[PDB]
Short mmCIF file of C-alpha atoms and ligand atoms in Angstrom, two decimals:
data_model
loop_
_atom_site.label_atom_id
_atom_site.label_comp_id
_atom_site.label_asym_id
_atom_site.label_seq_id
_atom_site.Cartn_x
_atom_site.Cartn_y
_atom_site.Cartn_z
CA UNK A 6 80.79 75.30 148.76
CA UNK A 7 82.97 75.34 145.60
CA UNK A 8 83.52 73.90 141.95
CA UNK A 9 84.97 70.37 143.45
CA UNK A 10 82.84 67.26 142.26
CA UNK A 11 81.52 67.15 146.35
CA UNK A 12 80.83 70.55 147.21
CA UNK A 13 80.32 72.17 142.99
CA UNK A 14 77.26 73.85 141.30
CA UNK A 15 75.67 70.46 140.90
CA UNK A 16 75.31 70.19 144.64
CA UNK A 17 75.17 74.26 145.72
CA UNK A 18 70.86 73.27 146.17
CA UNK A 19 70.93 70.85 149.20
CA UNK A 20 72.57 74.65 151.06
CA UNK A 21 71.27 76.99 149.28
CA UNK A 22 67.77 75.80 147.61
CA UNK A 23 67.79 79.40 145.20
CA UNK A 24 69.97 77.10 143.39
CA UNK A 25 66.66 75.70 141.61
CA UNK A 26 64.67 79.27 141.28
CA UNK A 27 63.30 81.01 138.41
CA UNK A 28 65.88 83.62 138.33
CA UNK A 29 69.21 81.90 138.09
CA UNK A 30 72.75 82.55 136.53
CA UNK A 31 74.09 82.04 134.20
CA UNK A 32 71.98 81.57 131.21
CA UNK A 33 72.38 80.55 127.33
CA UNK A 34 71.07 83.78 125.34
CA UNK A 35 69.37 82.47 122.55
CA UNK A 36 69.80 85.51 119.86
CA UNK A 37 66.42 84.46 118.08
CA UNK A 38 64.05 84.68 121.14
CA UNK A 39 65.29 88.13 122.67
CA UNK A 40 63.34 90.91 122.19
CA UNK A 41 64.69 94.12 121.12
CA UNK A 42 63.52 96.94 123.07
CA UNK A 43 63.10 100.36 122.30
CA UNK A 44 63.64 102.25 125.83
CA UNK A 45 66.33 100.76 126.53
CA UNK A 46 69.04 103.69 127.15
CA UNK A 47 72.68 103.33 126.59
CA UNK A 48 75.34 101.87 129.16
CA UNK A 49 76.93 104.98 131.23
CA UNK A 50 80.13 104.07 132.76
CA UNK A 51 82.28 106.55 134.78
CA UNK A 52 84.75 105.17 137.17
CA UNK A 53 87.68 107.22 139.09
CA UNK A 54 90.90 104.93 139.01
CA UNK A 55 91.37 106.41 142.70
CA UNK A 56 88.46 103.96 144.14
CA UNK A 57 90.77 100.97 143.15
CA UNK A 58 91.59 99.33 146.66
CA UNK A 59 92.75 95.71 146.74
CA UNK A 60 93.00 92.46 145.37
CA UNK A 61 92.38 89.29 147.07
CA UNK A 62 92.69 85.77 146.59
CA UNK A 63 89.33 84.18 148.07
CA UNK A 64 90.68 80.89 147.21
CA UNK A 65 87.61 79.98 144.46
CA UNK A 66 89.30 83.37 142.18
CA UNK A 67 90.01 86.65 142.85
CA UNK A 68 88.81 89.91 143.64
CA UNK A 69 89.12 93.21 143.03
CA UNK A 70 87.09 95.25 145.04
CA UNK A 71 86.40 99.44 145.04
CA UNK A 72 86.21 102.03 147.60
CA UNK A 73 82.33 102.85 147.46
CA UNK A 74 81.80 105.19 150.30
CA UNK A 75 80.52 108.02 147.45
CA UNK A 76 79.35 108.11 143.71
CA UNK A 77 83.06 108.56 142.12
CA UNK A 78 82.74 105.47 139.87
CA UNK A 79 78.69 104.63 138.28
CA UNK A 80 76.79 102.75 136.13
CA UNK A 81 74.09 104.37 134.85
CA UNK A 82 71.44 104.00 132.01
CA UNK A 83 70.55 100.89 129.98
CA UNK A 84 67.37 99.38 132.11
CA UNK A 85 67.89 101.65 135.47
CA UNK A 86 66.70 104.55 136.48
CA UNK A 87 69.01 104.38 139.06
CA UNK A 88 72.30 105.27 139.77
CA UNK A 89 74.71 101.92 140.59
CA UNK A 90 78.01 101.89 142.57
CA UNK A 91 81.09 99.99 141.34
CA UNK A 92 82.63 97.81 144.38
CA UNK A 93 84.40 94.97 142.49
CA UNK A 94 85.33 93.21 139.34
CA UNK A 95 86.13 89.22 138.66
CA UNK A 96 86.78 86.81 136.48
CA UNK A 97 85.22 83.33 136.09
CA UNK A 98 87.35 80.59 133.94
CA UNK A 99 87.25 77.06 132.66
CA UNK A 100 89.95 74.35 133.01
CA UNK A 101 90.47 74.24 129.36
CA UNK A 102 90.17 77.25 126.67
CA UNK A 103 87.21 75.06 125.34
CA UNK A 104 84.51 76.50 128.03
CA UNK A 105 84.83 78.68 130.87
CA UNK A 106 82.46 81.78 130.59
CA UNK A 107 78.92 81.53 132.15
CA UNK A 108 76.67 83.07 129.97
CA UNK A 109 76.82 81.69 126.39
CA UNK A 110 75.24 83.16 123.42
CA UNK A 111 73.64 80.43 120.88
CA UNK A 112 75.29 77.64 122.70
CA UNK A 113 78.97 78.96 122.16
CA UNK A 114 81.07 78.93 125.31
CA UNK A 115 84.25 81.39 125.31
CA UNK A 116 87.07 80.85 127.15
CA UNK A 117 86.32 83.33 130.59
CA UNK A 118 84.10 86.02 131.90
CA UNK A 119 85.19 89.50 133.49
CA UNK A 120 82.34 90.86 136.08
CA UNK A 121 82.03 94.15 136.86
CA UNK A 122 79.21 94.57 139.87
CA UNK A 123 78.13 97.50 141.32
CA UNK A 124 74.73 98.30 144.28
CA UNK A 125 72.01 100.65 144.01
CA UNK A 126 72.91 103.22 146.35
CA UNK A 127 69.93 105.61 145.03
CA UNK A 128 67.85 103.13 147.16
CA UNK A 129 70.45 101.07 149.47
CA UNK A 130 72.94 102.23 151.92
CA UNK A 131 75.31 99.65 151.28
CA UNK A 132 76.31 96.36 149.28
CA UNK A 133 74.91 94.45 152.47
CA UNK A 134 71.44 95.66 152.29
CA UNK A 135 71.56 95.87 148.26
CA UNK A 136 73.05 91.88 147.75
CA UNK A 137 69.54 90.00 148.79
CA UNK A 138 67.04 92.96 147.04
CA UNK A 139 65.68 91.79 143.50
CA UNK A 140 66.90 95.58 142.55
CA UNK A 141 70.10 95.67 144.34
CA UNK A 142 72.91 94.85 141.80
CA UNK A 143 73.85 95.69 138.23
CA UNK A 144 76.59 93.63 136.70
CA UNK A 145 78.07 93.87 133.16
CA UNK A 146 79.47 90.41 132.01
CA UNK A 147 81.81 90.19 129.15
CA UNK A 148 82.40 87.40 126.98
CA UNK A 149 85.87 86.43 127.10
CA UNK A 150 87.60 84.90 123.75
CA UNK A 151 90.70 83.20 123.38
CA UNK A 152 92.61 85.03 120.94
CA UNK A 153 95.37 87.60 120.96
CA UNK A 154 97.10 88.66 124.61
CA UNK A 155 94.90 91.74 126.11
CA UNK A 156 97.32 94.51 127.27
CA UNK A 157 94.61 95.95 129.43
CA UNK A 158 94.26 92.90 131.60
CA UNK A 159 98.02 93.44 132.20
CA UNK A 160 97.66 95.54 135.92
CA UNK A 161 95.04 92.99 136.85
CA UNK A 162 97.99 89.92 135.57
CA UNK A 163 101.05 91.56 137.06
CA UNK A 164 99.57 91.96 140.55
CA UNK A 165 98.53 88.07 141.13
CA UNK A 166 102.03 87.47 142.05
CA UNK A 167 101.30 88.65 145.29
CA UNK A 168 98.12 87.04 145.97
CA UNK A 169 99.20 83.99 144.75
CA UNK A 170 97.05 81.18 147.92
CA UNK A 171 94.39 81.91 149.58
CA UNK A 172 93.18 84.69 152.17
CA UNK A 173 96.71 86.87 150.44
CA UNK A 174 95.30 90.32 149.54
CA UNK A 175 97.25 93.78 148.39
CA UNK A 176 96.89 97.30 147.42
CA UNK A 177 95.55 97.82 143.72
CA UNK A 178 94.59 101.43 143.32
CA UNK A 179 94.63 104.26 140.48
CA UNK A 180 93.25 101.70 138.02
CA UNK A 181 89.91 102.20 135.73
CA UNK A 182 88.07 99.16 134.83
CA UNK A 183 85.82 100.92 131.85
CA UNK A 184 89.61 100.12 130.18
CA UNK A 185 88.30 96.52 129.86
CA UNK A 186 85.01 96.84 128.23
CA UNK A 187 84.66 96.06 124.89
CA UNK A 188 84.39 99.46 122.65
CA UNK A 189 80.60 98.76 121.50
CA UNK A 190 78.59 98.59 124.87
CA UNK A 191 75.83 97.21 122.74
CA UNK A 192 74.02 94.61 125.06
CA UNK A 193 71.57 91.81 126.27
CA UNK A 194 69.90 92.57 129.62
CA UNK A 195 67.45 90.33 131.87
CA UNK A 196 66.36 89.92 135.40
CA UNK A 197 68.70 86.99 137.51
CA UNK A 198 71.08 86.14 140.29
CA UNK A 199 74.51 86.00 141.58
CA UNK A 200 76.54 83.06 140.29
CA UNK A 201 77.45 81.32 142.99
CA UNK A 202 76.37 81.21 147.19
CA UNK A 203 74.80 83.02 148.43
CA UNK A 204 72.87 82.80 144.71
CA UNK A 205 70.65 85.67 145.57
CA UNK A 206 67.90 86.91 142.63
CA UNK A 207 69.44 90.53 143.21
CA UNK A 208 70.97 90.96 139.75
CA UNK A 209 70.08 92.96 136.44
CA UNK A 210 72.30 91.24 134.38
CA UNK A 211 74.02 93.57 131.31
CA UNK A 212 75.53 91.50 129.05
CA UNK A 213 77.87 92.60 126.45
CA UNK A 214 77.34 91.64 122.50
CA UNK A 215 81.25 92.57 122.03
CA UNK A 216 83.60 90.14 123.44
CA UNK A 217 86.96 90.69 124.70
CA UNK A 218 90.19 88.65 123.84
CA UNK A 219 92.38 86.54 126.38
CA UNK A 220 95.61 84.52 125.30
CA UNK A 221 96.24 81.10 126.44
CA UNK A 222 98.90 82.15 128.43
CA UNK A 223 97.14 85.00 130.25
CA UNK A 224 93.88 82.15 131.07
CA UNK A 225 97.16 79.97 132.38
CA UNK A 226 97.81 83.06 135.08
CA UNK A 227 94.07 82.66 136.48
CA UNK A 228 94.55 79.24 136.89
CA UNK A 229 97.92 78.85 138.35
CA UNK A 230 96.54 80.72 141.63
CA UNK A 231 96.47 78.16 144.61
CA UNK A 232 93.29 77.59 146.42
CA UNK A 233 95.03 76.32 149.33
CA UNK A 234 96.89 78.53 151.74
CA UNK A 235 100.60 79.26 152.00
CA UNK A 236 102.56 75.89 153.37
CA UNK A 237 100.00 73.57 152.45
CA UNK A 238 99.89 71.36 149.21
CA UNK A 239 100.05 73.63 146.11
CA UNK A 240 96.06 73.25 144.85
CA UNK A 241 95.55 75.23 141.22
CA UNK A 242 92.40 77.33 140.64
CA UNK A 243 91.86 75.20 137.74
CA UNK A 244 87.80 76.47 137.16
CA UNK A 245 84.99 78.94 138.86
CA UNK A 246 82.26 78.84 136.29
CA UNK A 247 79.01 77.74 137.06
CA UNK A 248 76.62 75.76 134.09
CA UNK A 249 74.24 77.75 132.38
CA UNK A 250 70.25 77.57 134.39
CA UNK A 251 66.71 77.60 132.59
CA UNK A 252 65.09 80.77 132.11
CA UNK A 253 61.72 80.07 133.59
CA UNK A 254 60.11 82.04 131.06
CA UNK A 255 62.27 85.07 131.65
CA UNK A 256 62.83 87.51 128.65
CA UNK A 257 65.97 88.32 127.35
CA UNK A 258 65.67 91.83 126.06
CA UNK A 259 68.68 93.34 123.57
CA UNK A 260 69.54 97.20 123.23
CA UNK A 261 70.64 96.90 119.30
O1 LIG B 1 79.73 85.73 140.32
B1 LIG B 1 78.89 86.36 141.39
O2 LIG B 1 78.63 85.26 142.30
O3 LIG B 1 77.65 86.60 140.72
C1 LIG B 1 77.72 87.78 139.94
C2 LIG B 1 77.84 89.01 140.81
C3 LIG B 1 78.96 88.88 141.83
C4 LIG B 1 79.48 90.02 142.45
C5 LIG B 1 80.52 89.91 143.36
C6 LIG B 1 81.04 88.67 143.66
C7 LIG B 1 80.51 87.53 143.07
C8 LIG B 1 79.46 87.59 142.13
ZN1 LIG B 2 81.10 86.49 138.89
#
């Protein structure tokens, strides 16, 4: 699978038939049907830069993934009752500035999306058991506009250089990814799936109202990673988001 015109979202059914399920991702959050609702709790975010572990190219985008042996770095509140792990944050872009998020609000697309996933380990073991169970993973997406440069994404920037084709990985510790949520954590939350294979329906979505900025020139770094590996034809990482999927009569529900 990928984002090529052969093996792309368009096709990712005829593999993986959760492709065409009632709780897909991404979705367009239409502001006037959501329904505002009173228990929701706010976000809780506490994450110890010392779980920052590596970075890896995994030759669709990148990777940053979290030591999460212990409960050093949680989500909590919002919908849950329980307590979620942090074990990696992403990015999804577009080829242009024009689109390149996944979730769009009203219609709009921004520019990227930064996901920060984490695994219920009040009921799991692991992120292996957690990633198929409809409670299993919490993930805050952020909206992504192209704008002024974002000195916070400037760790995350520096350390592609190394990581630069596919299957390279490095150390990238002491770093604290709250640092790139936007400072209202005012949000939209429903019930859906990971964004591309496996596509499992294991996701409480927590989208942020906020959005973040991104300069040109930073969204040029994503996508001047190579897909291919080292010696073989130089292949950009010119897009990794996936079209926006019907809600099946899900309910977008909003904190504020
Ligand atoms: O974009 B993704 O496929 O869906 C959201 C959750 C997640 C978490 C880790 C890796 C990938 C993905
Ligand atoms: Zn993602």
């Amino acid at each position: 699978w990928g984002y090529d015109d052969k093996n792309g979202p368009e096709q990712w059914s005829k593999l993986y038939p959760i492709a065409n399920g009632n709780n897909q991702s991404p979705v367009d959050i239409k502001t006037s049907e959501t329904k505002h609702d009173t228990s929701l709790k706010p976000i809780s975010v506490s994450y110890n830069p010392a779980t920052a572990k590596e970075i890896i190219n995994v030759g669709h985008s990148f990777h940053v993934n979290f030591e999460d042996n212990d409960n050093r770095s949680v989500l909590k509140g919002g919908p849950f009752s329980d307590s979620y792990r942090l074990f990696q944050f992403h990015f999804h872009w577009g080829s242009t500035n024009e689109h390149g998020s996944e979730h769009t609000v009203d219609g709009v697309k921004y520019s990227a999306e930064l996901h920060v996933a984490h695994w219920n380990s009040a009921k799991y073991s692991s992120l292996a058991e957690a990633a198929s169970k409809a409670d299993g993973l919490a993930v805050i997406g952020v909206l992504m506009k192209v704008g002024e440069a974002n000195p916070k994404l400037q760790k995350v920037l520096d350390a592609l250089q190394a990581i630069k084709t596919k299957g390279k990985r490095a150390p990238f510790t002491n770093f604290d990814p709250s640092t790139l949520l936007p400072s209202s954590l005012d949000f939209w939350t429903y019930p859906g799936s990971l964004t591309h294979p496996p596509l499992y329906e294991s996701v409480t979505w927590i989208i942020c109202k906020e959005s973040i900025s991104v300069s040109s020139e930073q969204l040029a770094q994503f996508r001047s990673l190579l897909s291919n590996v080292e010696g073989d034809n130089a292949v950009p990482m010119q897009h990794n988001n996936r079209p926006t999927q019907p809600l099946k009569g899900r309910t977008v529900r909003a904190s504020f």
